[PDB]
Design a protein around this ligand. Structure first.
Ligand SMILES: CC(C)CCC[C@@H](C)[C@H]1CC[C@H]2[C@@H]3CC=C4C[C@@H](OC(=O)CCC(=O)O)CC[C@]4(C)[C@H]3CC[C@]12C
Ligand SMILES: CC(C)CCC[C@@H](C)[C@H]1CC[C@H]2[C@@H]3CC=C4C[C@@H](OC(=O)CCC(=O)O)CC[C@]4(C)[C@H]3CC[C@]12C
Ligand SMILES: CC(C)CCC[C@@H](C)[C@H]1CC[C@H]2[C@@H]3CC=C4C[C@@H](OC(=O)CCC(=O)O)CC[C@]4(C)[C@H]3CC[C@]12C
Ligand SMILES: CC(C)CCC[C@@H](C)[C@H]1CC[C@H]2[C@@H]3CC=C4C[C@@H](OC(=O)CCC(=O)O)CC[C@]4(C)[C@H]3CC[C@]12C
Ligand SMILES: CC(C)CCC[C@@H](C)[C@H]1CC[C@H]2[C@@H]3CC=C4C[C@@H](OC(=O)CCC(=O)O)CC[C@]4(C)[C@H]3CC[C@]12C
Ligand SMILES: Nc1ncnc2c1ncn2[C@@H]1O[C@H](COP(=O)(O)OP(=O)(O)OP(=O)(O)O)[C@@H](O)[C@H]1O
Ligand SMILES: Nc1ncnc2c1ncn2[C@@H]1O[C@H](COP(=O)(O)OP(=O)(O)OP(=O)(O)O)[C@@H](O)[C@H]1O
Ligand SMILES: [Mg+2]
Ligand SMILES: [Mg+2]
Length: 1176
């Protein structure tokens, strides 16, 4: 389970990682070979050169000779170092490039496999789980795995190789002593293991919190219109904030525990240093060990221990990857019972559909206590039409879902031609099914592509034939871009009837043997319904149909009608047989970018409130970062005091003071490392929480037209927020802390060299530009593709989210493979850029390391000229060189910061742009008139409006209408005529191009936006709920006020939904599904009606609030509204005749214009359009 990742390596990734590990081992061993010349060899000649120099030895004749000898040996070692520089160049690329190449390939396969696993789950699995977390897992956790399985493992292996090189060199030069030094290595190993395990657990919890935050964001952004209409921005921001607070506290805990562990680790390592130094002093005083021997072993083990210490961020990244892999591979390992990707099962050649439901018992997985079907029995013969009639929630849509095997029955059997559908192949079974759902859902693509999801290889002639049969041909040809016009998310940029007709055509192109039509004409007008019904009846002979309808005209011509009661069929037979049996059908019928370079810095300004955390951390960065180079200087005293120590007692005292100093340095290192990690980590967590909060608030501030933009889809927005926050976080925190430490390491070197040797400091002037340019050029590349990589990423996150939100449609259309192919295609450009980065970062790291070895060689050469010319002491040369190597050991980590900084800068620029964005219709604005009283007069005067996504099409052409308090306005007309546009404009979702809208004679642009929307109670054409309880969904109707239980129950009673909630276990605490899919269509609509009514609004806007209701439920809701007619102004959009005649005034809208206005009797008196609609 620990090594559950690397599952998809394969032979190529296994060889990329074997060869890279060998290259890392060679690169690591290159550094103890550097130390091999110290202590002895070069330093054997040195403590021989001046400490053991003769006071005078014909120095005028032979000191020049040993200086030349040391000139000659230094030149040889300079050649050796140039060779090592070339070798390190080669091995450093292979290490870094191959490791990132393998990480990139594995991450590509992991993303594909995780998406495939999500697409393989059952409908019940989606019902039980909160799938809004899945896109956050796709974007955040996979990137967390990527940073722990890549070149960081190569760096860890290089550090381990350097440590082992010091290990062998110490034992070769002198054992028993390096045993004392390295006997504490198991303690550090256990400490690192515990550290990593705690980091992994904290990462798992933090990713859970971030996934919950992403689920909240996805739910809110998907239903943004409902949030805006009901003024829910503050509360949704608050739920998002609660998840962010959980993530922030987890991150702070992680930082504290990790840093206290690391500080204890360094306290232990310096205590070990002190004990080892005492032991070495004892040995060297005993004369068992020469001073050079202890020098060599100490220095060799010291560099290896320093490499191990610098390896810690790699272990942290590996632990974070392990913490991230948990949920991803848990989902990947899940196996569904109803497998749609299985190749098993029967595929009959010729099917003459004989549908049978025998003794069907079903309870939904998420509400298993509730029985929906109790021994349901139904038979459908080939070529026959069955009409399922009954009250809302009876289980008709449940039967439709069971027919396509979205769930298995608890008891009983669903059979085709006497064969159990469990034994049939799932994909084959669902491919011969054409289905139109109760509330059709489209995809964010073109009309032609939406229809092509029904059948992939359908030609344009068959698409035209289907849209002619679906009565969608005319409006498609009328609008520009023809079939290539792109519909909104879920088809939101079409009218309800247009979307329904598109879904009908999508079902028709399948050429299905079995057609399920769950209220396929709910959003249609009378003429469209009639023509679509004629088209369907034209081809009823070769196919079996199960139709659900609340319109009696469609049920009239059905071959057989089945009535639902108590979960069973009570009446089945012919229309005349049903009239004669006087059943339930009897009662039913009599009820007739710029990317500014300073952007990242600006983001850091947003963290300025945490300035005291930074300064302390900066100090903690200056001290310990300056300690590693200064470790040389004091160590120069360590030998220097000992060599001139003289008597054994004086040397013993000096060495025990040195050991005490080492212990003090360990205490200081514990303190400073804990502070440097903790302060920067806490500042980073605070910054990330603040940035996420601000970005979500800005997104909730934006206009409706902004969400209508094709770039601003729900998946794109969620991916944008998560990715920008993560990329900015990548450059802040402990990462920035270690960068500051490394900068201190590199910085103290200049000063200490300047005191000790100034000429050699000129090399830093020659060494730093050459590295620096190598840094900036990569800056230009990794930035340029990052702007692309994010954009493409926003595409991929779109495809996944559209697939996860619309999963039931995808499964019904058998389009899991198509969406997987699109998701794989959207990953191509990022995957190629990941392969390009491997070589680019491999080359850069390789060049930087060579340059260090090349500078080392130059220093040794430069050093000799100085010594052969008596310009500097050799001891000073060695001290300066040790300073340079200790300072430069962190240059690799500094260069590794380049990929993070560019991504952070780009994401910072995007975050700054989104926060500063100001909408045209600002919902957060406190400006605007708030009238003391509201009379309820609504007027439209010459309103002309074009939707921003399709500005060439005029939707409203001088629309004018009036409605007063106590009056009911009934907007009727054909589909797509602009009825919902009026309600959207009254909510100030958009502003009209011309004309005006008045509320009590005051133009609504002058009014406060929130105040204006608070006077409105809206029921949208296709209502959307939240993944919350019924009580919370109703109480959403009046935010900024705590709605009591009594008011919620009263609203539910007014909406005729109270009885269903009360009978339901958990009652008002029953969690509804995502967007209300775990309810009946009529139940969800009634919940929406209760949500609008609990507000008690002055203007009630009902956009077909009774489309999915029963006749009895419609009657109850209508009488409830009638009892509260006076005292409010009501605007009603309805295709039902019975809801229109009681309205005070009726407006017929065609082509954005009023054609007929007046009462029911007046419109019936003249033989106009209204009479035509009535007669049909
Ligand atoms: C020690 C250094 C100097 C030599 C390089 C190590 C080689 C032993 C390895 C590591 C890189 C490998 C190559 C990396 C790239 C490819 C492409 C790769 O192409 C595919 O995988 C194609 C797609 C498919 O096969 O379906 C085939 C192996 C090959 C030639 C590899 C062959 C074996 C190589 C040369
Ligand atoms: C011997 C010294 C001079 C070092 C230089 C070696 C290169 C000249 C060779 C050895 C390593 C090879 C590379 C090893 C791996 C890759 C990545 C490989 O792409 C992948 O990662 C495969 C999967 C994918 O591309 O999707 C394409 C070939 C390439 C660049 C190989 C091209 C030839 C390279 C660079
Ligand atoms: C502390 C951090 C920075 C470094 C950790 C290094 C090791 C813990 C990693 C690095 C490379 C990994 C290996 C890379 C590839 C494979 C092959 C792969 O083998 C399988 O078991 C495959 C299973 C399958 O294919 O179904 C996964 C395990 C293994 C040995 C991995 C085991 C864990 C290893 C040794
Ligand atoms: C884009 C550029 C800057 C990158 C390529 C840099 C190389 C061309 C440089 C980097 C370090 C240089 C080396 C630094 C030091 C030495 C040692 C030097 O040794 C002697 O002259 C000593 C001879 C003696 O006294 O016995 C010879 C040149 C050499 C190999 C240099 C050769 C040229 C090197 C490899
Ligand atoms: C860090 C690298 C990658 C870029 C910069 C390289 C320089 C720092 C190197 C390359 C050429 C080197 C020089 C090449 C030759 C000489 C002459 C050399 O003279 C001798 O020792 C020769 C015998 C004699 O003294 O007569 C003294 C060092 C010096 C100045 C070297 C000093 C270091 C230099 C300037
Ligand atoms: N996914 C689900 N999880 C739990 N219960 C569900 C789910 N879908 C529907 N139900 C419940 O199952 C019952 C049957 O509802 P169903 O959707 O079958 O109604 P319908 O008869 O087709 O009615 P209408 O046409 O009014 O929507 C209701 O109590 C409903 O809330
Ligand atoms: N967000 C949008 N972007 C672009 N065009 C839109 C958008 N919403 C609706 N339209 C288009 O505006 C026109 C009127 O749509 P509207 O929803 O107002 O019609 P309607 O009369 O309510 O229709 P129906 O009875 O079918 O629900 C149609 O052509 C529709 O496709
Ligand atoms: Mg239904
Ligand atoms: Mg509409």
């Amino acid at each position: 389970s620990v090594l559950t990742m690397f599952r998809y390596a394969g032979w190529l990734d296994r060889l990329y990682m074997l060869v890279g590990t060998l290259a890392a081992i060679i690169h690591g061993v290159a550094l103890p070979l550097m130390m091999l010349i110290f202590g002895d060899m070069t330093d054997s000649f040195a403590s021989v050169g001046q400490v053991s120099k003769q006071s005078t030895q014909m120095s005028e004749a032979d000191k020049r000779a040993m200086f030349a000898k040391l000139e000659e040996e230094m030149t040889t070692y300079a050649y050796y170092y140039t060779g090592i520089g070339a070798g390190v160049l080669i091995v450093a690329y292979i290490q870094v490039s191959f490791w990132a190449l393998a990480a990139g390939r594995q991450i590509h396969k992991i993303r594909q496999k995780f998406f495939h696993a999500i697409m393989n789950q059952e409908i019940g699995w989606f019902d039980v789980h909160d799938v809004g977390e899945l896109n956050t897992r796709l974007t955040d956790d996979v990137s967390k795995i990527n940073e722990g399985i890549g070149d960081k493992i190569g760096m860890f292996f290089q550090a381990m190789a350097t440590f082992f090189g010091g290990f062998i060199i110490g034992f070769t030069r002198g054992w028993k002593l390096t045993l004392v030094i390295l006997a504490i290595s198991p303690v550090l190993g256990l400490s690192a293991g515990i550290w990593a395990k705690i980091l992994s657990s904290f990462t798992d919890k933090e990713l859970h919190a971030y996934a919950k935050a992403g689920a909240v964001a996805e739910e809110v952004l998907a239903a943004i219109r409902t949030v805006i209409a009901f003024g829910g921005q503050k509360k949704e921001l608050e739920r998002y904030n609660n998840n962010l607070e959980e993530a922030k506290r987890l991150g702070i805990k992680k930082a504290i525990t990790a840093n206290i562990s690391m500080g204890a680790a360094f306290l232990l390592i310096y205590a070990s240093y002190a004990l080892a130094f005492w032991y070495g002093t004892s040995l060297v005083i005993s004369k068992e060990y020469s001073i050079g021997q202890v020098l060599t072993v100490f220095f060799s083990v010291c560099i290896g221990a320093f490499s191990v210490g610098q390896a810690s961020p790699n272990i942290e990244a590996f632990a974070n990857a392990r913490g991230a892999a948990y949920e991803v591979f848990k989902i990947i390992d899940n196996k569904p019972s109803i497998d749609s990707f299985s190749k098993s099962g029967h595929k009959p050649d010729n099917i003459q559909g004989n549908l049978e439901f025998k003794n069907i018992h079903f309870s939904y997985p998420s509400r298993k206590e509730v029985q929906i079907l109790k021994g349901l029995n139904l038979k459908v013969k080939s070529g026959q039409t069955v009409a399922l009639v009954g009250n809302s929630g009876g289980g008709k849509s449940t039967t439709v879902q069971l027919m396509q095997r979205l769930y298995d029955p608890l008891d009983g059997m669903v059979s085709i031609d006497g064969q159990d559908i469990r034994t049939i192949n799932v994909r084959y079974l669902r491919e011969i099914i054409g289905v139109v759902s109760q509330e059709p859902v489209l995809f964010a693509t073109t009309i032609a592509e939406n229809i092509r999801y029904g059948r992939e290889d359908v030609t344009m002639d068959e698409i035209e034939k289907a849209v002619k049969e679906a009565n969608a041909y005319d409006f498609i040809m009328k609008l520009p871009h023809q079939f290539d016009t792109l519909v909104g998310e879920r088809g939101a940029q079409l009218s309800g009837g247009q979307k329904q007709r598109i879904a009908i055509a999508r079902a028709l192109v399948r050429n299905p043997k079995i057609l399920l039509l769950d209220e396929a004409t709910s959003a249609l007008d009378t003429e469209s319904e009639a023509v679509v019904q004629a088209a369907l009846d034209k081809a009823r002979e070769g196919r079996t149909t199960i139709v659900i309808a609340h319109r009696l005209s469609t049920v009239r011509n059905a071959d057989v009608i089945a009535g639902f009661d108590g979960g069973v069929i009570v009446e089945q037979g012919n229309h005349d047989e049903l009239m004669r049996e006087k059943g339930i059908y009897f009662k039913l019928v009599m009820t007739q970018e710029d990317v500014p370079p300073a952007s990242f810095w600006r983001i850091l300004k947003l963290n300025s409130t945490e300035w005291p955390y930074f300064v302390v951390g900066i100090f903690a960065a200056i001290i310990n970062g300056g300690l590693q180079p200064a470790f040389s200087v004091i160590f120069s005293k360590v030998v220097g005091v000992f060599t001139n120590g003289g008597p054994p007692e004086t040397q013993r005292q000096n060495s025990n003071l040195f050991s005490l100093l080492f212990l003090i340095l360990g205490i200081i290192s514990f303190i400073t490392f804990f502070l440097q990690g903790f302060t920067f980590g806490k500042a980073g967590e605070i910054l990330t929480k603040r940035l996420r909060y601000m970005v979500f608030k800005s997104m909730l501030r934006q206009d409706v037209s902004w969400f209508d933009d094709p770039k601003n889809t729900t998946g794109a927005l969620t991916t944008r927020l998560a990715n920008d926050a993560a990329q900015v976080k990548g450059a802040t925190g402990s990462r920035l802390a270690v960068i500051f430490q490394n900068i201190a390491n590199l910085g103290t070197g200049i000063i200490i060299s300047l005191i000790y040797g100034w000429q050699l400091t000129l090399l830093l002037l020659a060494i730093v530009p050459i590295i620096a340019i190598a840094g900036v050029v990569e800056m230009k590349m990794l930035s340029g593709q990052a702007l692309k990589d994010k954009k493409e990423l926003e595409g991929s996150g779109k495809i996944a989210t559209e697939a996860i939100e619309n999963f039931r449609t995808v499964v019904s259309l058998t389009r899991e493979q198509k969406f997987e192919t699109m998701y794989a295609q959207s990953l191509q450009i990022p995957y190629r850029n990941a392969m390009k980065k491997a070589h680019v970062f491999g080359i850069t790291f390789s060049f930087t390391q060579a340059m260090m070895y090349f500078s080392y060689a130059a220093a040794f050469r430069f050093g000799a000229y100085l010594v052969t010319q008596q310009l500097m002491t050799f001891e000073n040369v060695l001290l300066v060189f040790s300073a340079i190597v200790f300072g430069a050991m962190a240059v690799g980590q500094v260069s590794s910061f380049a990929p993070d900084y560019a991504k952070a800068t780009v994401s910072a620029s995007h975050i700054i742009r989104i926060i500063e964005k100001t909408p045209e219709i600002d919902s957060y604005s406190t400006q605007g008139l708030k009238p003391n009283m509201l009379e309820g007069n609504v007027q439209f005067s010459g309103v002309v409006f074009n939707y921003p996504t399709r500005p060439s099409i005029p939707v409203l052409q001088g629309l004018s209408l009036e409605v007063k308090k106590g009056q009911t306005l009934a907007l009727v007309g054909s589909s797509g005529g602009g009825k919902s546009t009026v309600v959207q404009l009254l909510e100030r979702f958009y502003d009209p191009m011309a004309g005006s809208v008045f509320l009590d004679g005051k133009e609504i642009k002058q009014l406060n936006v929130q105040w204006l929307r608070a006077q409105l109670g809206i029921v949208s054409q296709e209502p959307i709920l939240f993944d919350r309880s019924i009580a919370e969904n109703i109480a959403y109707g009046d935010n900024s006020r705590v709605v009591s239980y009594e008011e919620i129950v009263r609203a539910a009673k007014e909406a005729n939904i109270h009885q269903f909630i009360d009978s339901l276990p958990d009652k008002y605490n029953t969690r509804v599904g995502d967007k209300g899919t775990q309810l009946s269509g009529g139940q969800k609509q009634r919940i929406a009606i209760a949500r609008a009514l609990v507000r008690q609004p002055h203007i009630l806007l009902l956009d077909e609030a009774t489309s999915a209701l029963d006749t009895e439920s419609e009657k109850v809701v209508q009488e409830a509204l009638d009892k509260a007619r006076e005292g409010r102004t009501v605007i009603v959009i309805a295709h039902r005749l019975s809801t229109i005649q009681n309205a005070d005034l009726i407006v017929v809208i065609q082509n954005g214009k009023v054609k007929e206005h007046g009462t029911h009797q007046q419109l019936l008196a003249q033989k106009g359009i209204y009479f035509s609609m009535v007669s049909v």
